[PDB]
Specification:
- The structure is cut from a larger assembly and holds eight protein chains of eight kinds.
- By secondary structure, chain C is of the alpha+beta class.
- Chain C has six helices and ten strands.
- Chain C has one domain (about 1-240): Glutamine Phosphoribosylpyrophosphate, subunit 1, domain 1.
- Chain C has helices spanning about 15-25, 75-100, 105-115, 165-170, 185-190, 225-235; strands at about 30-35, 40-50, 60-65, 70-75, 130-135, 140-145, 155, 160, 205-215, 220.
- The N and C termini of chain C lie far apart (about 50 Å).
- Chain F is built from four helices and 13 strands.
- In chain F, β3 (about 20) and β4 form a beta hairpin.
- In chain F, α1 (about 50-70) packs across α2.
- The relative contact order of chain F is 0.20.
- Chain G is an alpha+beta fold.
- Helices cover about 35% and strands about 20% of the residues of chain G.
- Chain G has helices at about 15-25, 75-95, 105-115, 165-170, 185-195, 225-239; strands at about 30-35, 40-45, 60-65, 70-75, 130-135, 140-145, 150-155, 155-160, 205-210, 215-220.
- A five-stranded antiparallel β-sheet of chain G has the order 8-1-2-9-10, covered by helices on one side. Chain G has a five-stranded antiparallel β-sheet with strand order 3-4-5-6-7.
- In chain G, β5 (about 130-135) and β6 (about 140-145) form a beta hairpin.
- The radius of gyration of chain G is 19 Å and the shape is globular.
- Chain H is globular and about 55 Å long.
- Chain H has six helices and ten strands; from the N terminus they run αββββααββββααββα.
- Chain H has helices spanning about 15-25, 80-95, 100-110, 160-170, 180-190, 220-225; strands spanning about 30-35, 40-45, 60-65, 65-75, 125-135, 135-140, 150, 155, 200-205, 215.
- The termini of chain H are far apart.
- The chains are: A alpha+beta, B alpha+beta, C alpha+beta, D alpha+beta, E alpha+beta, F alpha+beta, G alpha+beta, H alpha+beta.
- The interface of B and D includes residues 1, 19, 59 and 79 of B.
- β12 (about 195-200) of chain E pairs antiparallel with β13 of chain F.
- The PDB classes it as hydrolase.
- The entry lists the keywords Proteosome, hydrolase.
- Cryo-EM structures and dynamics of substrate-engaged human 26S proteasome.
- Chain A: Proteasome subunit alpha type-6.
- The organism of A is Homo sapiens.
Chain lengths: ~240, ~250, ~240, ~230, ~200, ~220, ~240, ~230
């Protein structure tokens, strides 16, 4: 199943596999983190946890939610040093869309340009292919809300509900039973069904100081990050 | 970064070099081409390999490539490496014609390509080409010519040579049946169907399994004619009529 | 083995050892602590007197990047002042292009992306330094950041890097840095680095302190002699 | 930075390029796909199953157009495909800016396969892990070509790529003749993709694109449901 | 000027199922002829010609750069070149020297190979193609050739009257020009055969 | 050269003449001046006829590349942004005066691009040599939100003012109407000027021209 | 650009890629050359003809100018690119200093080209050895040879190729002063030399003499058929 | 297994610089002696074959009119250093209109001697003696493959280097004459070479304050041999 330096660099195994990429997928799992994204009928919600183990650390500088453009937000998993470098590219690629083409970049075209860059790392046998993932949300005209994931292999797809991190398979098994019964989704139900995803997988039943929620909706297309006070409003209504 | 370097350029402690000998090992298998001349005209007999029943059979040729307006080549080895060489000496002949306003002599086209082929065996840390190929053509200095290239970068003039899988068996029979300057372009065709009767293990000589192209000198034309599949099989059975006559009467 | 020679290869469980091996080189440098007060940041470095032959004021592990930004380093000292040169040069391009003094959330972002850039290729090694950045502005207050050799940065109310890291930050959270001004902090900065480094390991050591805030009128400079003599007067009362 | 500038693909002592032989193993483990030309147009049909019900199937596409009259499918790994699509999109433009003419389908495969051969010899790169099927109707007659990671190409009447490709080629050999219409070739392309799919072949588990003399186009799932109905 | 340094005149004219091209024979330097057999029409495949007029350097230079690019086209593709395709090829070659331009004005005339339909066009010195249906002219004595062709052209003409019209168009206009003359060669092509004739002009 | 455009209540009407004048001599009588960019965007060209051809093909190649990648319809502001960024780079050495018009998702949009890189969105524009004559018809008889029969009558009237008053203009009037669902490109919209009929028979016969040398070569 | 040191030192003081290339010379076909006082005579053996090839495209004796000839051994692909780089240099000497190239000058160009090429980055050394033969101005016939490490070196008689030690031992017991007496008698030394080598009994040998004012003039296999008769005829009667 | 070319030893020196020191132990031996009357400088040739022309090889070669050289170890890469020295003495004459001193020639070469690597490829495997008469009188220098040079008074380099140095420390004194320094060197070379001593196996060259660099030839040379 191995011959040559196929364990070390990005070349083909005798089985057709290539191991340096599928080693990098489980470099995401060393963060100890899990993020959930849910698309609604007229909105898009990202929820993720934050774990602050110290009192000496400033809790306002640990946000994994990042604002890419004025109308595009994202969440980052994996290791922190590679994830913040990939946000810096996505800020740069969106500004060049506006300068060259004169209008706001669609969120699927931005995920294509990130996945094309990540392809080149697993295409040359020199670079290390950036072991961190990527989840974007955004409102598109004549498409509504839409959610995309980009992995460090260069693959991407549009989702309807999304999990990434340590507890990915347990969260998606919860969500696929939720979506196929096909209830209609208001704004607050998508907030409710996203918090109760990682509250039943992780079994926490938390207070509002450990999670962070970004949202976009077609009445205010600005990507906005919720205050902990209004996080608490959805949380005490979740406990009926 | 020096741990992953494979050093495709260095010598071996016995003196020879391994990389092109592995390429000329691969040039034995996968293909069969041969040529012959003694008089007005020269031919390329090549055997097709993929004879599956689902193909379009287009592009006028399979292993024959027209290079100049009066010369062509037959190729053997890695087919993808062949497509880069064939459209490389195709414009070596054109940049000659741009410079001198005269068609290129057939010999110094071969030397120009075999210097590009030699350079990869010598520096750059680069995979050489596993491609050997034939050359027919005509020029005013010497007439009909026949050359052979090797992946090391050395060429040679010939009269009849094969680079097939059983090429040693073909050469051993070409120097058993031959005549210097008297094999006209009908006896050579009968001799061509005799040789690939031997080296092709698929017997009975399917007319779609081989390709034959001839280069004859018409006054200002130098006609390169890929002969069609309607006149192969009558040349096939003509070899078959005489062999039942010669066996029974001996 | 073989999976840990270059920084371009992951391990078969998905982590890079050349960064982890360079993180181990930090805990052989001694100790650098820095906490921020209510209205400023105070650094502190205990300096090992290796021999008598060196001069008092040699080989300072406490740099001065910009007019208001300070740096305290811990690691292989040649890589320390090499990172100090690009950070000193990065702030010069900000003032020349944008007109004003660089903020810390941008300065530590540009440096950490420069440190991260050497954790990807086989041609270069990761740095063997971790360091702290602290400053004060009149429009933003006090700031305090810290950068590991992987390239991760966060905000802190107080941090510690060196040999005894947990044994230093255990006593930092005994303080109350939210309300103290940067005068009584100077006595408390020195005290928590006398209780560390028992006299069996080192014979004698050197105190070196730093200081920034509006009491220093925004400029970064060293403490005066008389103030750090008060802290060295407040040294030998930890024997009770 | 810089590169490596040495080929990591060398000749074996048995005379075989081993990395290209391994790249064909990744092609054979891809999604199955068939392609059939019949006398007025070419049918390209593939097999696209999302792993779960959460995926949006109307987001990505296997069947891609290159120009007005050239489509292109694959069977291999995903991210390598989108690279040489964007390469082949550009190569059709530099032919058009010189000659003011849509590119022939033969000359596109001359230049796409030249990229793949150039990419298996140069320094510090692994070869592609995809094989292609390219259709198009230039000057009336249609065309159907197949490339490979080595850089060669062929001219097929009908062929299959992906898993169980050796069973599809026996199935097409007992099915295809010279005389079929386009709607007949659609019906036998679904009949050969049913050899290897799961139990439910719905309107969104497959993806079909056709050429005419009207040009290349890609079928919507409405009439794909009508072709999937009254099948097998 | 620059175009008046050597003279020259090329005319093409469309007929029924046939097309003819004509040019002068003089080579000279501003007052002084050197020879009377200078080639200005070049063959580009069967039933497709090109005429060049302008500076005598770039006439021989473009006609060799174009043949360099033509043989690469007809070997990479298995077919001959369409007359409309060569018009885009020549226009690409001249526009590359947008600021270093060649001083020539090409004229292309030929039959479409599958459907035998005539085609004529002309280009300026930086590559603006202009297809017409009656005639194109290029060279120094341009205005004299418009008075001929606007007064003599008929729409549907057999190859006999096509030859006599383009002959009287060239002989009367070039005689009125000073730096052009010394003989006129006429190529008239058609789907079955081709014809080269030289006319009895003033050697004056 | 006289090109013009207008924005009516549903779409955009563009118009032009068909003449290319080299020096003071009419070189082409049927030169088409309205170009293809996308299936919803066209452009008219003026100035150097070789510079406008090689520019309008470069941008139309990139928008075919761009729209086939995004999979949706191009926008008019993208063709505006590609043109004025590359004309500014060549510092006005490329003489290209363009009237850009199209109907994207946001509606109809009409631009005018000057060969140094300055653009402007306007409800009606004229470019070319006889543009001052065509402006006076627009300036006297424009009304916002006209019907397409009133618009086509207005543009053909304005192009005719550039025919009968400018020396370097005047032949068959081209038009094109772009709407949200219809593209009517039509070159001979009207024939304002004919050629008079010949009177004297000038006809020669075979044998009236002396031939020195003839050659015959057959083909097949 | 491929930057890698190919030729490096050994731990005892050798350059292994150099002396591996010397063994590629040590199995090429044998080339023998002596000099007379008025006519030089050098001729390779082992033509190894297979009677179906063009006899002129297999030649290993070429000319660099009118006065300078050259034979070689080793592998032929590296040879004819060193030759073509020598043809440019000896032509560029004439655009400079007006006289034709002295035979010592063209050996220093080949030897210095060959040394620095065992010194650069990412290049295996050449695998050929040469014999440069010419009669320069003022009619002084002399010859040289070139090691693959690049040490040019003059001789009175030499031989390279497969079986070169046995021929060099044969010449020292045979090279007298009166052996170079006649122009036909110096040829009888070379034909006696290569017949004491790999067999080549008139059918695989190709001598080529130069009479200090001619170009190279290869004798066809009729005088070698005549010379090998009489060289063996004198051997027939004495023993 | 394979190191790079630029690696330190655990004992700290290098690898391929130290390997090139071993390579000059295979070359032919050479002796130079500094005397206040002038610098004499000799070598053997190591003639291999009777068919070989003897004078085509050389070890003494001149750099300028007042500076000679002597090479050992390899020969083919010594000619690269000789050409850089000849150009350097002419650039100094062109720009300063004087003669470059013997010491400043040597450091102009010794800076070149350690410049290999993987950018812009191995150290040179020769060893050189530089004899010359500048304005400080006669000089004698000796460089290294490592690029380390130092003034010597009687230096013997080659395969018989350490055997000759011991026999040379006993006969040298600071008040020699050139006529006896020439004779004292050929006594040493008579011991260490393989073949017998004659007028073709060796050659000499002396540089004087009065005249320029003079190389002896096979007519004035054997009167030293017959009067040994």
């Amino acid at each position: 199943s191995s011959a040559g330096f196929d364990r070390h660099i990005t070349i083909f195994s005798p089985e057709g596999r290539l191991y340096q990429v599928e080693y990098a997928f489980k470099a995401i799992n060393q963060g100890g983190l899990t993020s959930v994204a849910v698309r609604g009928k007229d909105c898009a919600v990202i929820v993720t946890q934050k774990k602050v183990p110290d009192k000496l650390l400033d809790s306002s500088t640990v946000t994994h939610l990042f604002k890419i453009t004025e109308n595009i937000g994202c969440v980052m998993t994996g290791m922190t040093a590679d994830s913040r470098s990939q946000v810096q590219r996505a800020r740069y690629e969106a500004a060049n869309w506006k300068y060259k083409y004169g209008y706001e970049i669609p969120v699927d075209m931005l995920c294509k340009r990130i996945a094309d860059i990540s392809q080149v790392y697993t295409q040359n046998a020199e670079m290390r292919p950036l072991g961190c993932c990527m989840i974007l949300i955004g409102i598109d005209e004549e498409q509504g809300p839409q959610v995309y994931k980009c992995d460090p292999a260069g693959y991407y797809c549009g989702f309807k509900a999304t999990a990434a991190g340590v507890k990915q398979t347990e969260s998606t098994s919860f969500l696929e039973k939720k979506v196929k019964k096909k209830f209609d989704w208001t704004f607050e139900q998508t907030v409710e069904t996203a918090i109760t995803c990682l509250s039943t997988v992780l079994s926490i039943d938390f207070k509002p100081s450990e999670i962070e929620v970004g949202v976009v909706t077609v009445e205010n297309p600005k990507f906005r990050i919720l205050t902990e006070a209004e996080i608490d409003a959805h949380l005490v209504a979740l406990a009926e | 970064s020096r741990r992953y370097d494979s050093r495709t350029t260095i010598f071996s402690p016995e003196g020879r070099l391994y990389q092109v000998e592995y390429a000329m090992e691969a040039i034995g298998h996968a293909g069969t081409c041969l040529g012959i001349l003694a008089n007005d005209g020269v031919l390329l007999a090549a055997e097709r390999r993929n004879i599956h029943k689902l193909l379009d059979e287009v592009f006028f040729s399979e292993k024959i490539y027209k290079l100049n307006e009066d010369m062509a080549c037959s190729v053997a080895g890695i087919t993808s490496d062949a497509n880069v060489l064939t459209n490389e000496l195709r414009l070596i002949a054109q940049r000659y014609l741009l410079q001198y306003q005269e068609p290129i002599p057939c010999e110094q086209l071969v030397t120009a390509l075999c210097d590009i082929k030699q350079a990869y065996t010598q520096f750059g840390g680069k995979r050489p080409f596993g491609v050997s190929l034939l050359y027919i053509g005509w020029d005013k200095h010497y007439g009909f010519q026949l050359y052979q290239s090797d992946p090391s970068g050395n060429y040679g003039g010939w009269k009849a040579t094969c680079i097939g899988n059983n090429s040693a068996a073909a050469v051993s029979m070409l120097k058993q049946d031959y005549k210097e300057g008297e094999m006209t372009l009908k006896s050579a065709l009968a001799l061509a169907i005799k040789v690939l009767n031997k080296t092709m293990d698929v017997s009975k000589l399917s007319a779609e399994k081989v390709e034959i192209a001839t280069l004859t000198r018409e006054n200002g034309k130098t006609v390169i004619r890929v002969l069609k599949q309607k006149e192969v099989e009558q040349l096939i059975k003509k070899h078959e009529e005489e062999e039942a006559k010669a066996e029974r009467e001996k | 083995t073989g999976y840990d020679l270059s920084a371009s290869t992951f391990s078969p469980d998905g982590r890079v050892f050349q960064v982890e091996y360079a993180m181990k080189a930090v805990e052989n440098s001694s100790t650098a602590i820095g906490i921020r007060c209510k209205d400023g940041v105070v650094f502190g470095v205990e300096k090992l007197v290796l021999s008598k032959l060196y001069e008092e004021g040699s080989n300072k592990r406490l740099f001065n990047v910009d007019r208001h930004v300070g740096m305290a380093v811990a690691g292989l000292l040649a890589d320390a002042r090499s990172l100090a040169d690009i950070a000193r040069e990065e702030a010069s391009n900000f003032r020349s292009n944008f007109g004003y003094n660089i903020p810390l959330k941008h300065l530590a972002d540009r440096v950490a992306m420069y440190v991260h850039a050497y954790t990807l290729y086989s041609a270069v090694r990761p740095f063997g330094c971790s360091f702290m950045l602290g400053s004060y502005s009149v429009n933003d207050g006090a700031q305090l950041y810290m950068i590991d050799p992987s390239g991760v940065s966060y905000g802190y109310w107080g941090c510690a890097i060196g040999k005894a890291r947990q044994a230093a930050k255990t006593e930092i959270e005994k303080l109350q840095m939210k309300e103290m001004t940067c005068r009584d902090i100077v006595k408390e900065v020195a005290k928590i680095i006398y209780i560390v480094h028992d006299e069996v390991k080192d014979k004698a050591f050197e105190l070196e302190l730093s200081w920034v805030g509006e009491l220093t009128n925004g400029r970064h400079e060293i403490v005066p002699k008389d103030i750090r003599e008060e802290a060295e007067k407040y040294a030998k009362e930890s024997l009770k | 930075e810089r590169g490596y500038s040495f080929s990591l693909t060398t000749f074996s002592p048995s005379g075989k390029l081993v990395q290209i032989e391994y790249a064909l193993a990744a092609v054979a483990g891809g999604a199955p796909s068939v392609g059939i030309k019949a006398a007025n147009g070419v049918v390209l049909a593939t097999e696209k199953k999302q792993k779960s019900i959460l995926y949006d199937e109307r987001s990505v596409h296997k069947v891609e157009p290159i120009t007005k009259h050239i489509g292109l499918v694959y069977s291999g790994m995903g991210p390598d495909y989108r690279v040489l699509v964007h390469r082949a999109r550009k190569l059709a433009q530099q032919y058009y800016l010189v000659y003011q003419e849509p590119i022939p389908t033969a000359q596109l495969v001359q230049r796409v396969a030249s990229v793949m051969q150039e990419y298996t010899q140069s320094g510090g790169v692994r070869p592609f892990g995809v094989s292609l099927l390219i259709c198009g109707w230039n000057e009336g007659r249609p065309y159907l070509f197949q490339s490979d990671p080595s850089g060669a190409y062929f001219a097929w009447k009908a062929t299959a790529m992906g898993k169980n490709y050796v069973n599809g080629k026996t199935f097409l050999e007992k099915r295809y003749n010279e005389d079929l219409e386009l709607e007949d070739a659609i019906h036998t392309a679904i009949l050969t993709l049913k050899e290897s799919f799961e139990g439910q072949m719905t309107e969104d588990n497959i993806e079909v694109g056709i050429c005419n003399e009207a040009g290349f186009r890609r079928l919507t799932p409405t009439e794909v449901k009508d072709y999937l109905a009254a099948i097998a | 000027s620059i175009m008046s340094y050597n003279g020259g005149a090329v005319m093409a004219m469309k007929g029924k199922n046939c097309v003819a091209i004509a040019a002068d024979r003089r080579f000279g330097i501003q007052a002084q002829m050197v020879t009377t057999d200078f080639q200005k029409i070049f063959p580009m495949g069967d039933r497709l010609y090109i005429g060049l007029a302008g500076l005598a350097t770039d006439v021989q230079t473009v006609a060799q750069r174009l043949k360099f690019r033509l043989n690469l086209y007809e070997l990479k593709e298995g077919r001959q070149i369409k007359p409309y395709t060569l018009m885009s090829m020549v226009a690409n070659l001249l526009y590359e020297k947008r600021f270093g331009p060649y001083y020539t004005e090409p004229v292309i005339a030929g039959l479409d190979p599958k459907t035998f339909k005539p085609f004529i066009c002309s280009l300026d010195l930086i590559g603006c193609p202009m297809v017409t249906d009656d005639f194109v002219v290029s060279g120094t004595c341009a205005e004299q050739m418009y008075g001929m062709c606007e007064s003599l052209w008929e729409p549907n003409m057999d190859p006999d009257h096509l030859f006599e019209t383009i002959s009287q168009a060239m002989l009367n206009a070039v005689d009125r020009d000073a730096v052009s003359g010394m003989g006129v060669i006429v190529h008239i092509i058609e789907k079955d055969k081709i014809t080269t004739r030289t006319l009895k002009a003033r050697m004056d | 050269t006289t090109i013009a455009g207008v924005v009516y209540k549903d779409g955009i009407v563009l118009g032009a003449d068909t003449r290319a004048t080299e020096g003071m001599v009419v070189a082409d009588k049927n030169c088409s001046k309205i170009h293809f960019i996308s299936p919803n965007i066209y452009c008219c060209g003026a100035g150097t006829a070789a510079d406008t051809d090689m520019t309008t093909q470069l941008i139309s190649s990139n928008l075919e590349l761009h729209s086939l990648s995004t999979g949706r319809l191009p926008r008019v502001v993208t063709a505006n942004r590609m043109l004025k960024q590359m004309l500014f780079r060549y510092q006005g050495y490329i003489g290209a005066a363009l009237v850009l018009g199209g109907v994207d998702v946001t509606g109809p949009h009409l631009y005018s691009i000057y060969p140094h890189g300055s653009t402007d969105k306007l409800p009606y524009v004229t470019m070319g040599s006889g543009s001052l004559a065509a402006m006076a018809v627009f300036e006297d008889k424009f009304r916002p939100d006209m019907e397409e029969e009133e618009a086509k009558n207005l543009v053909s009237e304005a192009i005719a003012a550039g025919i009968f008053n400018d020396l370097g203009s005047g032949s068959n009037i081209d038009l094109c109407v772009i709407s949200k669902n219809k593209l009517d490109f039509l070159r001979p919209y009207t024939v304002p000027n004919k050629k008079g009929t010949r009177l004297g028979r000038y006809r020669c016969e075979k044998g009236t021209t002396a031939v020195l040398t003839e050659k015959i070569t057959p083909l097949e | 650009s491929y930057d890698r040191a190919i030729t490096v030192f050994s731990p005892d003081g050798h350059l292994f890629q150099v002396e591996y290339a010397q063994e590629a010379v040590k199995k090429g076909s044998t080339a023998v050359g002596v000099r007379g006082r008025d006519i030089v005579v050098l001729g390779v053996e082992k033509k190894s003809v297979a009677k179906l090839q063009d006899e002129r495209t297999v030649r290993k004796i070429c000319a660099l100018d009118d006065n300078v000839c050259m034979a070689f051994a080793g592998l032929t692909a590296d040879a004819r690119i060193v030759i073509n780089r020598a043809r440019v240099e000896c032509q560029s000497h004439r655009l400079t200093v007006e006289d034709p190239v002295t035979v010592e000058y063209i050996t220093r160009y080949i030897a210095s080209l060959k040394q620095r090429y065992t010194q650069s980055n990412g290049r295996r050394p050449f695998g050929i050895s040469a014999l440069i033969v010419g009669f320069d101005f003022d009619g002084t016939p002399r010859l040289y040879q070139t090691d693959p490490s690049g040490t040019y070196h003059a001789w009175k008689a030499n031989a390279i190729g497969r079986g070169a030690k046995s021929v060099r031992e044969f010449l020292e017991k045979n090279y007298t002063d009166e052996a170079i007496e006649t122009d036909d008698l110096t040829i009888k030394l070379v034909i006696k030399a290569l017949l004491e080598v790999v067999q080549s009994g008139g059918k695989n040998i190709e001598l080529a003499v130069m009479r200090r004012d001619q170009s190279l003039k290869i004798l066809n296999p009729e005088e070698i058929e005549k010379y090998v008769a009489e060289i063996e005829k004198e051997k027939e009667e004495n023993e | 297994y394979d190191r790079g070319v630029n690696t330190f030893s655990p004992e700290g020196r290098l690898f391929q610089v130290e390997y090139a020191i071993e390579a000059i132990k295979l070359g032919s031996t050479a002796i130079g002696i500094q005397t206040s009357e002038g610098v004499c400088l000799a070598v053997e040739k190591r003639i291999t074959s009777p068919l070989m022309e003897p004078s085509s090889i050389e070890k003494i070669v001149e750099i300028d009119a007042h500076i000679g050289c002597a090479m050992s170890g390899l020969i083919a890469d010594a000619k690269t250093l000789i050409d850089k020295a000849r150009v350097e003495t002419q650039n100094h004459w062109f720009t300063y209109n004087e003669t470059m001193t013997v010491e400043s020639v040597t450091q102009a070469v010794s800076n070149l001697a350690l410049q290999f690597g993987e950018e812009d490829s191995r150290p040179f495997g020769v060893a050189l003696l530089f004899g010359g008469v500048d304005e400080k009188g006669p000089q004698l220098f000796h460089m290294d493959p490592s690029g380390t040079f130092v003034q010597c008074d009687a230096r013997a380099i080659g395969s018989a280097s350490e055997g000759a140095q011991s026999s040379l420390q006993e006969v040298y004194h600071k008040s020699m004459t050139l006529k006896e320094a020439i004779k004292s060197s050929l006594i040493i070379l008579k011991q260490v070479m393989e073949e017998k001593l004659n007028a073709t196996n060796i050659e000499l060259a002396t540089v004087q304050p009065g005249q320029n660099f003079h190389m002896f030839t096979k007519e004035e040379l054997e009167e030293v041999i017959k009067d040994i």
